[PDB]
Amino acid sequence: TNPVLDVDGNELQRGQLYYATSVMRGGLTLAAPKGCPLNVAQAPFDEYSGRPLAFFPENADDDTVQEGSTLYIMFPEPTRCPQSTVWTFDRTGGTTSKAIGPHNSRFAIRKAGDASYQIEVCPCSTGVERPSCRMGTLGLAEGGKNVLLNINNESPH
Amino acid sequence: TNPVLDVDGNELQRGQLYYATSVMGGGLTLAAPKGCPLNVAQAYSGRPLAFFPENADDDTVQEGSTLYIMFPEPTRCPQSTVWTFDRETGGTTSKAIGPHNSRFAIRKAGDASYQIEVCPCSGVERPSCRMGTLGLAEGGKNVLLNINNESPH
């Protein structure tokens, strides 16, 4: 079909760590003030490569992530907030609080991937949007005409 | 200290996925009725685990030093897939992280003798099989011994 590749030329595997490193204006993190639900945001300083992401297709298969097929995204690291590190869309931006739902549509928790300077994210089932940097306390993710292009590079290889 | 080896004689890493398989039957999963939150349960080999020392150091899981345990997998419940002793007396799913001093029922520990075990540290005791629909996890004197084996290696 059309798998999503990493910066080395290799496919994306489910449960494996990748950085959402940006070819645009770095990676993504979990950031919110004071309290709790962390919101998905962009990494601040310059050593901040970001936090590693794990992508999980909805159906068990050959565990390869493909372009356009729906999935779940999560930061598989423990956080200071009790909410799930899996991505939710509020309808606002992306939060961390996501259940999983293998029924019919209406579930602002399923994302997807599609190409352009690499791949992109689509909060879609029948197609809703394509997130971009919010921009202003934290570089949150929303949806725009100028959209956040990122390349997925693997944490230890 | 002494590192927790996995079943192949190799150390436990952090982030690396491990199945906490029993020794006499099944691994650990997340389980509850049709209502949230989820509790750690026993049974398949279960669900994979992930261990995170509270210090970013050698990146080895070692005997005694505290750590967080998480299921790095998406769940049907909004709560964190990181462990949290409930103290009201099972293992739940509101895993926060705390660098403050003691009184934090989320950090755990490893203890040898099977091979390794678990402990709620910040210790109180060692978790057992709870048997409280599905078999949860409580701390007791009839401990639950598990062994850590790796998922694609």
Q: φ and ψ at A153, to 5 degrees? A: -115, 145
Q: How many CA atoms lie within 13 A of A109 on its CB side?
A: 23
Cis preceding linkage at A33, omega within 30 = no
**Binary contact (B74, A74; C-beta < 8 A):** yes
Residues contacting A21, CB < 8 A, separation 6+ = A7, A27, A49, A50, A150, A151, A152, A153
Q: Does A51 touch chain B (CB under 8 A)?
A: no
Task: Dig out the tokens for B42 from the structure.
Answer: 């026993």
Resolution as reported, in Å: 3.0
Helix (H) or strand (E) holding B126: strand B126-129
**Binary contact (A81, B74; C-beta < 8 A):** no
Task: Dig out the tokens for B101 from the structure.
Answer: 């001093």
Task: Dig out the tokens for B117 from the structure.
Answer: 């075990």
C-beta atoms surrounding A96 within 10 Å: 24
- Give A74's contacts in chain B (Cβ within 8 Å): 72-74
Q: Does B35 touch chain A (CB under 8 A)?
A: no
* Rounded (10°) CA dihedral A81, A38, A100, B29: -20
Residues contacting A104, CB < 8 A, separation 6+ = none
- Give A101's contacts in chain B (Cβ within 8 Å): 76
Q: Which domain holds residue A135?
A: 1-157
Residue B133 near residue B93, CB atoms below 8 Å = no
- Give A17's contacts in chain B (Cβ within 8 Å): 15
Experimentally determined by: X-ray
Q: Which of A30, A5, A35, A1 is nearest to A18 (CA)?
A: A5
Q: What is the sign of the dihedral through the CA atoms of B104, B79, B27 and B90? A: positive
How distant, in Å, are the alpha carbons of A24, A38, A99, A149, B11 from that of A132?
Answer: 10, 18, 23, 8, 41
Task: Tell me which long-range contacts A86-94 makes (C-beta under 8 A, separation of at least 24).
Answer: A86/B74, A86/B75, A87/A40, A87/A111, A89/A123, A89/A128, A92/A142, A93/A39, A93/A40, A93/A131, A93/A134, A93/A140, A93/A141, A93/A142, A94/A39, A94/A40, A94/A131, A94/A140, A94/A141, A94/A142
How distant, in Å, are the alpha carbons of A60, A153, B42 from that of A76?
Answer: 19, 16, 22
CA atoms of B23 and A90, how far apart (whole Å): 44
Cross-chain CB nearest to A84 (options B52, B68, B79): B79
CA atoms of B139 and A74, how far apart (whole Å): 30
Task: Dig out the tokens for A110 from the structure.
Answer: 């399923």
- Give B17's contacts in chain A (Cβ within 8 Å): 15
Residue A112 near residue A80, CB atoms below 8 Å = no
Task: Tell me which long-range contacts A87-91 makes (C-beta under 8 A, separation of at least 24).
Answer: A87/A40, A87/A111, A89/A123, A89/A128
Q: Tell me the nearest-neighbour CA distance from B95 into chain A, angstroms.
A: 5
Looking at the structure of chain B, the number of domains it has is 1
CA atoms of B145 and B143, how far apart (whole Å): 6
Residue B12 near residue B148, CB atoms below 8 Å = yes
First-residue to last-residue Cα distance in chain B: 25
First-residue to last-residue Cα distance in chain A: 24
